[PDB]
Design a protein around this ligand. Sequence first.
Ligand SMILES: *[C@@H]1O[C@H](CO)[C@@H](O[C@@H]2O[C@H](CO)[C@@H](O)[C@H](O)[C@H]2NC(C)=O)[C@H](O)[C@H]1NC(C)=O
Ligand SMILES: *[C@@H]1O[C@H](CO)[C@@H](O[C@@H]2O[C@H](CO)[C@@H](O)[C@H](O)[C@H]2NC(C)=O)[C@H](O)[C@H]1NC(C)=O
Ligand SMILES: *[C@@H]1O[C@H](CO)[C@@H](O)[C@H](O)[C@H]1NC(C)=O
Ligand SMILES: *[C@@H]1O[C@H](CO)[C@@H](O)[C@H](O)[C@H]1NC(C)=O
Lengths: 111, 449, 298, 150, 32
Amino acid sequence: DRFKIEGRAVVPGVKPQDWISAARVLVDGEEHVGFLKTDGSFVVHDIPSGSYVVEVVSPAYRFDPVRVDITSKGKMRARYVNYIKTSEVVRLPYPLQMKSSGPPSYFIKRE
Amino acid sequence: EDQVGKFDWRQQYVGKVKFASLEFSPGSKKLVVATEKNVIAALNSRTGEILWRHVDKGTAEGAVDAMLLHGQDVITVSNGGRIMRSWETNIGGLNWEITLDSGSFQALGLVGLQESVRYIAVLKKTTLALHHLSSGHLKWVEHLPESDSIHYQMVYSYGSGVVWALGVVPFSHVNIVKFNVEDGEIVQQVRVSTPWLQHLSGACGVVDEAVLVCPDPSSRSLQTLALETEWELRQIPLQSLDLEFGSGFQPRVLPTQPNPVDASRAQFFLHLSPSHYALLQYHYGTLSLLKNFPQTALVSFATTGEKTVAAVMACRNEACFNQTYTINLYLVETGRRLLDTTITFSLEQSGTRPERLYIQVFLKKDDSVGYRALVQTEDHLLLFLQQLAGKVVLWSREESLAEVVCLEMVDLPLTGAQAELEGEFGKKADGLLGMFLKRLSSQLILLQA
Amino acid sequence: YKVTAFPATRNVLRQLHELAPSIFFYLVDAEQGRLCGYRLRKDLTTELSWELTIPPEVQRIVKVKGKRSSEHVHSQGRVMGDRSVLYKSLNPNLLAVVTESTDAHHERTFIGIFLIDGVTGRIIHSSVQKKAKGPVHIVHSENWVVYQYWNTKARRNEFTVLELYEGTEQYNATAFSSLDRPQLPQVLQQSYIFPSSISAMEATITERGITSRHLLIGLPSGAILSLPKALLDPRRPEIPTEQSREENLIPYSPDVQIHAERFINYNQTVSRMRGIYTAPSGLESTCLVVAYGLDIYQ
Amino acid sequence: GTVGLLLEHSFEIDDSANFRKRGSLLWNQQDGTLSLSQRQLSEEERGRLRDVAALNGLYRVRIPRRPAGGYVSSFVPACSLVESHLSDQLTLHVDVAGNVVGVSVVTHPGGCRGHEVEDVDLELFNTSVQLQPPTTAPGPETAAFIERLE
Amino acid sequence: LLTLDASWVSSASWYFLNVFGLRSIYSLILGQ
Ligand SMILES: *[C@@H]1O[C@H](CO)[C@@H](O[C@@H]2O[C@H](CO)[C@@H](O)[C@H](O)[C@H]2NC(C)=O)[C@H](O)[C@H]1NC(C)=O
Ligand SMILES: *[C@@H]1O[C@H](CO)[C@@H](O[C@@H]2O[C@H](CO)[C@@H](O)[C@H](O)[C@H]2NC(C)=O)[C@H](O)[C@H]1NC(C)=O
Ligand SMILES: *[C@@H]1O[C@H](CO)[C@@H](O)[C@H](O)[C@H]1NC(C)=O
Ligand SMILES: *[C@@H]1O[C@H](CO)[C@@H](O)[C@H](O)[C@H]1NC(C)=O
């Protein structure tokens, strides 16, 4: 009936103990909330079948959301997120390996 | 434009505190708090800032059911008893997360054996489970007999190597089930009749060696039962101790188990009537009134190892005179107030009273015992009081602002200069020559300034 | 249904006895789905003027967003190329009722927008977004209505903009009386995609209403996006034209991208947002923004 | 086939509620058409309407919620109705399920100007009738955007 | 801003207005 989404977030060069104390894992935008472990991993429980969009939220590091499809029999698959062309699939690994692209650009340079 | 801090400001809040854990090294300055906003944070002891914070779902799916502390780890049970987590307080992350079996949640407690805490005990209206501590893997799980009628509400265990699940039927019999820790087999089962008893969670409590104790005001006595070496509720009256329960009130027994692996404390507290407590001691079947605290608002316990102490709060001259509250420390082994251990504070609002009281004790340099008190009032205000005199309030935190419902921005009053513009303009002078001199005098005052 | 005035002095009593038939109350009962509207008589009594009913068997009211009484509209019209003017339908008594279907099946749920006039009750607009789900965040302002929802067929958050444009000649440039407005406004709708959820939504307000209108959108990740309302325009054509270039209009792109450079709070995330308040700020180019959830941010 | 919904009007000097039977709306749910069958204004009703136009009163239109079980109403200034030679427009707003939601009265031309009208211009109703279901909102157009990507 | 009135001018317009308005003032401070 209900399943769990496992994953292992990782930031290059930075240790987990430096950023896990402020990050979360949101499935369908606060519809399901999970938190990260000490080694960077994470597990979200009580996920019924369907297509959700997992995103690791952190104020100091950005991650790319991943679309996870869970069939009613438990089979879990991952792919890219594309709201246009909701039929396109780009097979991503599973359990989710969500690496960061560095800190986000909150500011615009002068001039 | 990377000009931060000049215009914007952010204030982080956590909701009304529901479970606070102050038992620590306590050399580390940490204060873990679970709130009524489904938030678990680690407040700083010395300043009151948020070290780390974790915000769960704002709906009922995120309600924290129970919270215990073992060493540097904090075990939390939430989502109606469905999810269990272990937070590491230093890093602020997670140690392990597991999903508990369905069913209502009734009690959570640690168990151990051989002078070491090894497992966690979870109680649900249909079953008692024991999980590991460092891994979260389920050790075993056992059904509860007569679960359809017996509401199981308590879990007690120490180094004896067994667990006691205590259930009651409203205005009917109570039933104790003693399981073994290393096997899960039901070792023993006991039933006792209770026409007077109505609750087991907020009414009864276990004492030093599996001693269930709680009052019946219908007979105005205390019923006792040594779960180890007894099977009958010995009834001890309070007429010898001159104590009386509050008419139409539900009395309460408050024990203290400092170590979840060793025996409990023979001494305990008894709440007979609101604003009235009594510190008693149970010794091999008889009670001894150690102290009687009348007009006392709140009480709390602490251990600092072996020097177990209690803290009581009372008004100064009174319903309180000027919201002047004094907190004092007593020893559990003997109701002797500890000298030079009085904290006096005051609440700025009129109809505000303290509601919670947690104590963090340490050993002073001169072999004495010092303490800091976390007091939560009616308006969700948190106060951290220290033993000093000029700074009796270490840090305050207004958590009532986590639920802003309305907001309006009013313009500040007019400056002393802009106040003059109303004078010269709008006085409605009779003639032009009069208004001329009026405006000239205003500008003259301006040039003088 | 008796009205109490505060302050109830003799001067206010006279100013109400002389201004009674211009005051209209409207009450929205969400449990019964009723929308009643009462007229204030001279002796502080109310008489039932209009009444609508939205049956709770199929639709339940969630939001009733009237436009703020402190905002001002600078330009009463918009240049539509060729030096031609298209006038706005700035009804000062308009309500944008939002309803959700009781049937919550992913193939039959729907959202409903009802642009009603508060004084007369004439439903200016009745729209139904099919295969959509709540929660519905709505922003109603001078002329437009921007509401967000969750398309369940494609499983994505979607914005929808409604702009109420009058003809090329205004019915009356002296006043606006909801009793003497027979013409129906031209409602232009357009829907966009949004790649994230929404925890709150508000629009910036200023004293004269000269500067550009932005939508402060509080996401669940705490970051407060600042989306230009000029991007949420119903006139963005699906295929470019010469007039679209002359008016400087961008062709219609459904992907409303979220760029980190737009977050008005760099890393001061507001966890579990619940509201965004905007104040005119005395100047004409700054808006005082206060986002209140768990954390407060100004 | 068709369903008959009452239609009542009320116009009084004291602005009270005195709804009297004006006519009936015939509604074809299988086709979506709406027609009206009324009774013309009598001499006393025309006199009351002229006096109400003099007193700047109102003109209230009401229909039952279901063809008793409820009333759905609206209003229009009687001045506009009198000065517009009884040229009015009724709109019946319904739901998706076919429930009667609202009634809307409009007077063409809108706005009162105190134009004097003879009795012979108040003895023949000129009422347009419309049925309004909710219009389906548009969604994001992705196909055209996918082609434009090429 | 495309909505702000055309009467409100930037700094260059002010400079050019001054350039064209001080030509006749130059004749007062100078001999011409
Ligand atoms: C626009 O509406 C106003 C009033 O609604 C009209 O102005 C006049 O207002 C006075 C009352 O103070 C009355 O004589 C009438 O209500 C109006 N005069 C006429 C002849 O109707 C105004 O006429 C309307 N039209 C325009 C173009 O302004
Ligand atoms: C949030 O953003 C602000 C501004 O970038 C950070 O504050 C600055 O942090 C850096 C340290 O590397 C220095 O520039 C200054 O010490 C801070 N002030 C300014 C004006 O730059 C802040 O550290 C960020 N908070 C995080 C990442 O947690
Ligand atoms: C009440 O307490 C405050 C602070 O202790 C003090 O300022 C105030 O004077 C007191 N008032 C009375 C009547 O005690
Ligand atoms: C009758 O109604 C129509 C619809 O508005 C209107 O155009 C026409 O002028 C009216 N004619 C008369 C005689 O009322």
